[PDB]
Amino acid sequence: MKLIVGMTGATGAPLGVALLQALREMPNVETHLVMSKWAKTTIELETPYSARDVAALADFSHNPADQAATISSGSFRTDGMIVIPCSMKTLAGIRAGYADGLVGRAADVVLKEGRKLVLVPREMPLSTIHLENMLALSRMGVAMVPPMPAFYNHPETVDDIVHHVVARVLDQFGLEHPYARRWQG
Amino acid sequence: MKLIVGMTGATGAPLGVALLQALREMPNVETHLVMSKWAKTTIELETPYSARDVAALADFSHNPADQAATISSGSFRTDGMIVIPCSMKTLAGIRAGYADGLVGRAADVVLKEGRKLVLVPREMPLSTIHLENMLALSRMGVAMVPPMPAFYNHPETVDDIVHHVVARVLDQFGLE
Amino acid sequence: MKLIVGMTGATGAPLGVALLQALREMPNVETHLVMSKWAKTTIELETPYSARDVAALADFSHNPADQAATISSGSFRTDGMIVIPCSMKTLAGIRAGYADGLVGRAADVVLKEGRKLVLVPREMPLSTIHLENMLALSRMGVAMVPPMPAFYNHPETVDDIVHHVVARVLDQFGLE
Amino acid sequence: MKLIVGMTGATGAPLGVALLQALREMPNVETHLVMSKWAKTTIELETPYSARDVAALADFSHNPADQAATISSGSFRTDGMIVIPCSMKTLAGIRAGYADGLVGRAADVVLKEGRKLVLVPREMPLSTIHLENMLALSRMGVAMVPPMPAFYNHPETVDDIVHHVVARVLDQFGLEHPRWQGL
Amino acid sequence: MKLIVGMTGATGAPLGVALLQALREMPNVETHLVMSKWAKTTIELETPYSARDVAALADFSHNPADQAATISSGSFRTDGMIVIPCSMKTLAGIRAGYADGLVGRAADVVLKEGRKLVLVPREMPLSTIHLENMLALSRMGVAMVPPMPAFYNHPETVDDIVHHVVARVLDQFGLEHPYARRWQG
Amino acid sequence: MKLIVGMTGATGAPLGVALLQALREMPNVETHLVMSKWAKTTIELETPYSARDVAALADFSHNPADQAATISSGSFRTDGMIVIPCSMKTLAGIRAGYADGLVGRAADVVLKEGRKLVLVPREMPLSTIHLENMLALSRMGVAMVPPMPAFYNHPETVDDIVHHVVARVLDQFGLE
Amino acid sequence: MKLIVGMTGATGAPLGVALLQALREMPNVETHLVMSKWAKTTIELETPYSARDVAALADFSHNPADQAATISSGSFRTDGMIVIPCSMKTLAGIRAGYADGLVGRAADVVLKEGRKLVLVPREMPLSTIHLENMLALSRMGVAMVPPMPAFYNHPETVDDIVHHVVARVLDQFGLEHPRWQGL
Amino acid sequence: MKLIVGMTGATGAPLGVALLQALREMPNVETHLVMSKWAKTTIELETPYSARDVAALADFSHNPADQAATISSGSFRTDGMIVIPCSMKTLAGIRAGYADGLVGRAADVVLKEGRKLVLVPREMPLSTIHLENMLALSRMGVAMVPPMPAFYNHPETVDDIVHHVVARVLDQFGLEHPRWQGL
Amino acid sequence: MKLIVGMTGATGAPLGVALLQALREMPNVETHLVMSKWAKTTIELETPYSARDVAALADFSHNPADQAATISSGSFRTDGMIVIPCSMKTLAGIRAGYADGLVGRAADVVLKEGRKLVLVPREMPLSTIHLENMLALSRMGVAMVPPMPAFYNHPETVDDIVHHVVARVLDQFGLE
Ligand SMILES: Cc1cc2nc3c(=O)[nH]c(=O)nc-3n(C[C@H](O)[C@H](O)[C@H](O)COP(=O)(O)O)c2cc1C
Ligand SMILES: Cc1cc2nc3c(=O)[nH]c(=O)nc-3n(C[C@H](O)[C@H](O)[C@H](O)COP(=O)(O)O)c2cc1C
Ligand SMILES: Cc1cc2nc3c(=O)[nH]c(=O)nc-3n(C[C@H](O)[C@H](O)[C@H](O)COP(=O)(O)O)c2cc1C
Ligand SMILES: Cc1cc2nc3c(=O)[nH]c(=O)nc-3n(C[C@H](O)[C@H](O)[C@H](O)COP(=O)(O)O)c2cc1C
Ligand SMILES: Cc1cc2nc3c(=O)[nH]c(=O)nc-3n(C[C@H](O)[C@H](O)[C@H](O)COP(=O)(O)O)c2cc1C
Ligand SMILES: Cc1cc2nc3c(=O)[nH]c(=O)nc-3n(C[C@H](O)[C@H](O)[C@H](O)COP(=O)(O)O)c2cc1C
Ligand SMILES: Cc1cc2nc3c(=O)[nH]c(=O)nc-3n(C[C@H](O)[C@H](O)[C@H](O)COP(=O)(O)O)c2cc1C
Ligand SMILES: Cc1cc2nc3c(=O)[nH]c(=O)nc-3n(C[C@H](O)[C@H](O)[C@H](O)COP(=O)(O)O)c2cc1C
Ligand SMILES: Cc1cc2nc3c(=O)[nH]c(=O)nc-3n(C[C@H](O)[C@H](O)[C@H](O)COP(=O)(O)O)c2cc1C
């Protein structure tokens, strides 16, 4: 299983780091990371990790301006892509198909190859434009997994919420997060 | 100021309790609470409070089946409504106009009177139907304020995230 | 009052410079300027001023690449935004939501927060694409105030036409 | 070349007058003028000219209520039409196809024959209805040429703006008015 | 507060007269009336007032063919417009934007300036065209306030129904009709 | 039977005159004629008749400006309406609902009451706008019976073509 | 000039024949004819001519089933196409893009190359499906020219109507057939 | 004739080079080239030529970031534009109207002036977003000319395919490159 | 594996012949060929082969008129279908659902059963109609794999271009 992990400059960099950490604990999974310029800023602000620390969580890390990277090619097989978190700018770019950098190009390629795209859109409030773009991509089979907190499993800390979101994102690829707190009835 | 607060059976009952607690501190605000049947289950499961405790946080607590409540009529003036959290079922009913209980009727009335409606939709993932319904209501000027965690202010506890969302919902009505 | 003034590389930088001069005559208004890269080219070709001169007309002048500026945050309260003049490319980015820089990000934020956005779109002719984008934004309550000459008040000079457009743009925020 | 020129009651009668003057200097262009009722009001308020003065600038002048004029039939060949300036009411009538007078009829005819219609829409602000109407006609190949002032060529007077607008309108028919290059 | 009051040739002229009467009793409110040709006919048929009697209820009255009236200009500030009753022809004109007379022009101007437009559409049955036009304008924020009778407050006379409609129309401008019979529970 | 016959200023007044002559041969049919201003021009250019002659072919001839005529009321029962011929402008007014005169008002009323409307649209070529308007009305059950020549029955004269169109128009109301 | 002329099984074979005769009088126009199967039936029933007679009126006559004809490729340059008259079935095939025979293929080719397609649609009444199909092609710049009789020029015979229709069809290609003025 | 030629970072730089060479053989055609950043990468990887070599094939070469170039204004008359090959990113930018660089701007200008835009879209497979974008521009009269190989004329080399594509692109402007007939 | 391979009369019969040759090198794949009437013309003009030669490349070759063939039944399990090359007319028939022959019927069945359909659409230029039909089918999950030349791997011959297209078509079914 080869997964692309795009990270983007929406607040919620801890979500990306945690997903990358959980992926690192699965040996059957090769990860290709692309951090946008603004994701690097957000990682540094919101987590104790640097961008290089996060890059080291992945098997491969590609430059966001590098349209000649492996994952820019359709013939280079992957099982899909997660953008976490996904900003409104990146969301809008993917919907329009304006593949100006590698996050956008890798996403455009994933879609043309029929591979799974999972977005973790984060913004509040959501406007009509945000919702239009989300719907357009949803109709195409793109999974929309905003980081909405669950309270039924009695979370206490931010980590509790992050890990639940990560588990529910991973569900999209039939992957089992080993600390998921699921509904029992 | 008169505000309708709808509570609904989406996970996130602490979101609604906290908004009610904040509003309680504002004497200038008259609150009209409508807890759905499933919001009572979610409150009692996810909070240390009972439905009756939450009811006591509001100036009025209308029965979710009472289509004869003051707020069911457009002639009764309010400043608008918040549904927090808002389930996909309730969202869908509002979009369709299928006003079969008081949460749905109050919302339909708010919309027909040109009053402010603010929804706190909570579901994950969001499907095509959810997004269709959300989009259609957004085009009508309904505020969509999902409980999206912000990390730029370095939250530590669930209370931190809850506090942030409530502050932003309050913002929709110029409240601090 | 807090107003964001975006300047964009459409011909008509004198419209933007004149608006900022008129705002500087109002001591109660805090102005946040964002000049695009091409707006600087246009200012220097069409006005007596340099980019620095125009920057000095506003309380703040943010870098058009700086997505961390105050006005990129929703929680930072403003009374809205004017893009004057507004090129088709900027208009297109806003309609699409492709918030690549601060003009785009500030606009996207103004819209999500339900604040007032006023665009001064300048292009001739207007293509199908231009009108599509204008129509979509208009349905959302975005004011479209193109710099259309009025001849009923018998203008004589360019300044007369400029002044009239500015006053009507100002009029959107109930200003004289 | 045969061109229909419609004038309409939006502010900007000076734009229509200057177009007719520019077309008057071109011998192998036959102009057919239709001034709307409210255009006469706008001409007289905004220019030093009377209605008859403006009518004299064109080869033919047709009554706005005359649905039996030459230009109201598609069998009468022309090279197209300019409405300058074009009010929101006239723009809406054309979009709807409600051809109540000659301006609407001629425009409707130009469209059905597949000839070139150029509109000079003027209103501010532009509402949702305005934009909807403009977009629907744009999709049909109707040129939308609002009188948007250019500043890159350093205008000083109203005339500078008016003549530039006229030049860019004329461009639609490949006609040269007596521009951007490098920087 | 400056309000434009358009009247139109749908049955229901008593609704217009009553709204104008109620407005006359509010000194903070300047009214600009435009009666269509057919409204004049309807006023004379349905009320004991003449058109001039109704004109005298307003602070200003403009000619329906007068595209040069104050209210035809956007720069002339008003707080909005009510068309009461609003015929299907007038409704259709406003939706198409075919601003052929002053009722239509003043309405078109109100919409371009972002001011409040309140329509009191009256026709029965409603056809697909009526409904299309009503919806198009509704999506733009135009208030659709058809004169539908309420029976919960136990009306007895036509006046009872007229005054309730008028009160509910006035609600659109935050104005208080002093004889409103509101729902008490 | 009560039928409204609208005449409109499209070329093809002989189609309208012939329809009225054929109806006058049916003693059970009460005809309500409304000739538009331009229909009078067309009748006088294309037929041997004057406006008065054509008016005398029907039981009633209402003034095209008279919005108070019997047929302007829905409660006044009719079996429907034919517009023959129907110009694009009249077709456009009906589709838009801009019922400025009696032809338009009578049509708008026929539609709201669910009565049968038959249009004989005449124009060549048919533009996008014309087809839009025709399609919209067609979706509502409005019959579109343009005066299309049939050559299978070997016509020789204009009257043969005219007669065939009239019979097929008549056929809409199960008439011979 | 190279023009494709398609004929189709709507009533109005006399319209197609008269178009070919008018084009035959024009030396610098090369006509390519495609008669549909049902058009041959309509020609023989409605005219004094046989199928071969009509084929002789054109420079080239292609089999309606021949998808290998010159006109079935976009590399073979023409100035466009007229389908006269055009049945609802053929109109629907073109709209759908279901280019089963040469009439549909040539029309599909004309469209993809951005050349001028003119249709002479004939049916009565017109249904919702007819109008939908006509509208969709109209939006793409396809001229819709139904054979609508004009009466203002005082016709007496069927020929008068036929020749006027032909003249107005030819107008689409700027060709003059051997009209409205004033009143 | 004045033609804008845009080159873009889709595979198929040989297609753009061959178009410029073919246009170079035509004296009364003035070509304005705009190579995108990624097009230079594609040229160098896929051809024996450098960026400067290709720029020398055109009369004018404009920087892709230069929004002040002659071709960025509608007052500067051209006969239209070819983007060859056209990436999905550039195709999407044009459709959206997001005219961030000169390729997008010139294309946006060509469209607003009603001049002819021809795109040579290349990607495989084509996604829903690609097709949506292509369709929206097609509706506006933008020619969509993907580099689809023909086999009926029996090609042997890559050059055979390239030159046929070029010929069919040129067809859009009525230019003859130095085809199907019968069977 | 069971694969349906439709061949259609677009130029590019060498693409279809090459695909069938590549499949014949895979012993686990049962191929069901349907050559259209015009595909036979194209094969004989563009390849060294006759229709019989191409038929012999597949396990089954069904008559393009035979709506009773095995693959016309949904209950007959397959892994999907490739149309290579796919003309605009065939593409149009599939999008419309006008399943007049076996290529159309087999495709309509593949879609109703939720099996994979891969079209190799070949035409230049692509008109509005072509793109409409392609877009509609694409929204349903139909893969659009037009024979687009790739120059990054430095091809020299027609066979190089052909081979690359085939491998990417194959790639849709996870084949080499
Ligand atoms: C600290 C901070 C927080 C931000 N949070 C969000 C957010 O949650 N949602 C969003 O759409 N953009 C957010 N942005 C704005 C984006 O970072 C900006 O639009 C940027 O251009 C995104 O580019 P990228 O998607 O390529 O990373 C934030 C920016 C800053 C600096
Ligand atoms: C503990 C629990 C959590 C739930 N969370 C959600 C949720 O997050 N989003 C949602 O749409 N529905 C959620 N539901 C399901 C809704 O309660 C259910 O659709 C119900 O019909 C909603 O009715 P109501 O909106 O009137 O309260 C949840 C149910 C349970 C019991
Ligand atoms: C002098 C000159 C005049 C221009 N005028 C316009 C114009 O009026 N409308 C427009 O959309 N673009 C115009 N542009 C092109 C834009 O500058 C270009 O699209 C640029 O990318 C806009 O970027 P921005 O919106 O961030 O400023 C002009 C460019 C130049 C230099
Ligand atoms: C002097 C004055 C200025 C006007 N300016 C405009 C204008 O700028 N745009 C517009 O749409 N209408 C404008 N109008 C209103 C129109 O004249 C009015 O809608 C009229 O019905 C148009 O009719 P017409 O298009 O047949 O001329 C103006 C009216 C007056 C008297
Ligand atoms: C007495 C009478 C009652 C009418 N009632 C209505 C009605 O309720 N609804 C409607 O749309 N038109 C009604 N009309 C028809 C309109 O008056 C007619 O369409 C007229 O053209 C409207 O023009 P106006 O809107 O400019 O006044 C009525 C007409 C008459 C004479
Ligand atoms: C002799 C002549 C022939 C006309 N023929 C047509 C026609 O066939 N189709 C059309 O839409 N308008 C035609 N018109 C133009 C209309 O008469 C014009 O649009 C008029 O405003 C229609 O108004 P009415 O529908 O109320 O009669 C013709 C006009 C003249 C005088
Ligand atoms: C003599 C007769 C008259 C016909 N007239 C028409 C007609 O007016 N309009 C139409 O759409 N079809 C008409 N048809 C039916 C068509 O001929 C039939 O749909 C046929 O399949 C058309 O095929 P084609 O377009 O390939 O010629 C007529 C058929 C017959 C035999
Ligand atoms: C050699 C290689 C081949 C590429 N081929 C294509 C292609 O076939 N189609 C496409 O849309 N993008 C292709 N790309 C990706 C684009 O180059 C990338 O999206 C870039 O941002 C396009 O920018 P531009 O249109 O300004 O040149 C390719 C990239 C590389 C490095
Ligand atoms: C040699 C030649 C090449 C053709 N090339 C194409 C083409 O590339 N695209 C297309 O849509 N049709 C093409 N056709 C036309 C089709 O063969 C025609 O539309 C036929 O009806 C298709 O039917 P089918 O899809 O059942 O094979 C070509 C025809 C000939 C004979």
PDB file of C-alpha atoms in Angstrom, chain A residues 11-15 45-47 121-129 131-132 134-135 138-139 143-152 154-162 164-165 168-169 172 183, chain B residues 11-15 45-47 121-129 131-132 134-135 138-139 142-162 164-165 168 172:
ATOM      1  CA  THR A  11      -4.904  25.187  11.399  1.00  0.00           C
ATOM      2  CA  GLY A  12      -4.720  21.537  12.439  1.00  0.00           C
ATOM      3  CA  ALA A  13      -1.121  20.527  11.716  1.00  0.00           C
ATOM      4  CA  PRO A  14      -1.274  18.180  14.771  1.00  0.00           C
ATOM      5  CA  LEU A  15      -3.813  16.128  12.748  1.00  0.00           C
ATOM      6  CA  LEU A  45       3.508  27.148  15.130  1.00  0.00           C
ATOM      7  CA  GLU A  46       1.127  24.390  16.287  1.00  0.00           C
ATOM      8  CA  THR A  47       3.444  21.475  17.079  1.00  0.00           C
ATOM      9  CA  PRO A 121     -11.184  20.143   5.059  1.00  0.00           C
ATOM     10  CA  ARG A 122     -10.812  22.637   7.913  1.00  0.00           C
ATOM     11  CA  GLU A 123     -12.378  26.097   8.060  1.00  0.00           C
ATOM     12  CA  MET A 124     -15.065  27.777  10.202  1.00  0.00           C
ATOM     13  CA  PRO A 125     -17.478  29.170   9.336  1.00  0.00           C
ATOM     14  CA  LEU A 126     -17.933  27.525   5.941  1.00  0.00           C
ATOM     15  CA  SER A 127     -19.123  29.846   3.175  1.00  0.00           C
ATOM     16  CA  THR A 128     -21.099  29.138  -0.003  1.00  0.00           C
ATOM     17  CA  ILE A 129     -17.859  28.823  -1.993  1.00  0.00           C
ATOM     18  CA  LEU A 131     -19.567  24.274   0.328  1.00  0.00           C
ATOM     19  CA  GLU A 132     -19.811  24.416  -3.516  1.00  0.00           C
ATOM     20  CA  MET A 134     -16.793  20.411  -1.277  1.00  0.00           C
ATOM     21  CA  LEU A 135     -19.976  19.239  -3.004  1.00  0.00           C
ATOM     22  CA  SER A 138     -17.978  14.789  -3.166  1.00  0.00           C
ATOM     23  CA  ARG A 139     -20.096  14.009  -6.268  1.00  0.00           C
ATOM     24  CA  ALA A 143     -14.212  11.629   0.751  1.00  0.00           C
ATOM     25  CA  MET A 144     -14.841  14.723   2.850  1.00  0.00           C
ATOM     26  CA  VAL A 145     -13.593  14.100   6.371  1.00  0.00           C
ATOM     27  CA  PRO A 146     -13.587  17.393   8.317  1.00  0.00           C
ATOM     28  CA  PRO A 147     -12.016  17.113  11.795  1.00  0.00           C
ATOM     29  CA  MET A 148     -15.297  17.227  13.771  1.00  0.00           C
ATOM     30  CA  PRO A 149     -14.924  16.240  17.462  1.00  0.00           C
ATOM     31  CA  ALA A 150     -16.867  13.313  18.911  1.00  0.00           C
ATOM     32  CA  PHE A 151     -17.992  13.544  22.555  1.00  0.00           C
ATOM     33  CA  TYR A 152     -19.714  10.163  23.010  1.00  0.00           C
ATOM     34  CA  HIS A 154     -15.761  11.017  26.632  1.00  0.00           C
ATOM     35  CA  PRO A 155     -12.606  12.767  25.386  1.00  0.00           C
ATOM     36  CA  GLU A 156     -10.544  14.751  27.892  1.00  0.00           C
ATOM     37  CA  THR A 157      -7.627  16.182  25.947  1.00  0.00           C
ATOM     38  CA  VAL A 158      -6.892  17.549  22.492  1.00  0.00           C
ATOM     39  CA  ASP A 159      -4.885  14.363  21.802  1.00  0.00           C
ATOM     40  CA  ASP A 160      -8.116  12.381  22.423  1.00  0.00           C
ATOM     41  CA  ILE A 161      -9.863  14.366  19.673  1.00  0.00           C
ATOM     42  CA  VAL A 162      -6.896  14.264  17.256  1.00  0.00           C
ATOM     43  CA  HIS A 164     -10.255   9.883  16.979  1.00  0.00           C
ATOM     44  CA  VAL A 165     -10.199  12.040  13.831  1.00  0.00           C
ATOM     45  CA  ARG A 168     -11.830   7.840  11.251  1.00  0.00           C
ATOM     46  CA  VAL A 169      -9.702   9.190   8.383  1.00  0.00           C
ATOM     47  CA  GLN A 172     -11.275   5.327   4.572  1.00  0.00           C
ATOM     48  CA  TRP A 183     -19.480   3.452  19.415  1.00  0.00           C
TER      49      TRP A 183
ATOM     50  CA  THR B  11     -22.547  14.155  19.222  1.00  0.00           C
ATOM     51  CA  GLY B  12     -21.417  17.460  20.758  1.00  0.00           C
ATOM     52  CA  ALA B  13     -24.003  18.116  23.471  1.00  0.00           C
ATOM     53  CA  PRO B  14     -21.275  19.890  25.532  1.00  0.00           C
ATOM     54  CA  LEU B  15     -21.266  22.495  22.723  1.00  0.00           C
ATOM     55  CA  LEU B  45     -24.596  10.636  27.860  1.00  0.00           C
ATOM     56  CA  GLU B  46     -21.965  13.320  27.092  1.00  0.00           C
ATOM     57  CA  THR B  47     -22.431  15.799  29.959  1.00  0.00           C
ATOM     58  CA  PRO B 121     -23.561  21.037  11.775  1.00  0.00           C
ATOM     59  CA  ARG B 122     -21.666  18.048  13.109  1.00  0.00           C
ATOM     60  CA  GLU B 123     -21.046  14.831  11.171  1.00  0.00           C
ATOM     61  CA  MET B 124     -17.978  13.107   9.750  1.00  0.00           C
ATOM     62  CA  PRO B 125     -17.433  12.204   7.004  1.00  0.00           C
ATOM     63  CA  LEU B 126     -19.793  14.543   5.205  1.00  0.00           C
ATOM     64  CA  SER B 127     -21.635  12.863   2.346  1.00  0.00           C
ATOM     65  CA  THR B 128     -22.956  14.329  -0.909  1.00  0.00           C
ATOM     66  CA  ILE B 129     -26.444  14.655   0.601  1.00  0.00           C
ATOM     67  CA  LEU B 131     -23.151  18.853   1.462  1.00  0.00           C
ATOM     68  CA  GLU B 132     -26.124  19.438  -0.907  1.00  0.00           C
ATOM     69  CA  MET B 134     -25.686  22.587   3.648  1.00  0.00           C
ATOM     70  CA  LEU B 135     -24.988  24.357   0.345  1.00  0.00           C
ATOM     71  CA  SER B 138     -25.862  28.595   2.779  1.00  0.00           C
ATOM     72  CA  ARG B 139     -27.174  30.155  -0.504  1.00  0.00           C
ATOM     73  CA  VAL B 142     -27.777  30.402   6.763  1.00  0.00           C
ATOM     74  CA  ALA B 143     -24.489  30.521   8.698  1.00  0.00           C
ATOM     75  CA  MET B 144     -22.640  27.211   8.736  1.00  0.00           C
ATOM     76  CA  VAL B 145     -20.501  27.028  11.850  1.00  0.00           C
ATOM     77  CA  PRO B 146     -19.249  23.441  12.195  1.00  0.00           C
ATOM     78  CA  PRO B 147     -17.234  22.706  15.397  1.00  0.00           C
ATOM     79  CA  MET B 148     -13.830  22.738  13.691  1.00  0.00           C
ATOM     80  CA  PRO B 149     -10.944  22.700  16.211  1.00  0.00           C
ATOM     81  CA  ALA B 150      -8.434  25.534  15.993  1.00  0.00           C
ATOM     82  CA  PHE B 151      -4.863  24.688  16.977  1.00  0.00           C
ATOM     83  CA  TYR B 152      -3.164  28.047  16.405  1.00  0.00           C
ATOM     84  CA  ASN B 153      -4.067  29.084  19.984  1.00  0.00           C
ATOM     85  CA  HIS B 154      -2.530  25.909  21.482  1.00  0.00           C
ATOM     86  CA  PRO B 155      -5.555  24.257  23.139  1.00  0.00           C
ATOM     87  CA  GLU B 156      -4.890  21.536  25.728  1.00  0.00           C
ATOM     88  CA  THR B 157      -8.308  20.325  26.848  1.00  0.00           C
ATOM     89  CA  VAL B 158     -11.670  19.538  25.245  1.00  0.00           C
ATOM     90  CA  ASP B 159     -12.984  22.606  27.170  1.00  0.00           C
ATOM     91  CA  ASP B 160     -10.545  24.811  25.208  1.00  0.00           C
ATOM     92  CA  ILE B 161     -11.933  23.640  21.846  1.00  0.00           C
ATOM     93  CA  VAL B 162     -15.537  23.870  23.078  1.00  0.00           C
ATOM     94  CA  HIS B 164     -13.510  28.478  21.019  1.00  0.00           C
ATOM     95  CA  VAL B 165     -16.461  27.140  18.978  1.00  0.00           C
ATOM     96  CA  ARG B 168     -17.455  31.949  17.289  1.00  0.00           C
ATOM     97  CA  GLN B 172     -22.708  35.585  14.657  1.00  0.00           C
TER      98      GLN B 172
END
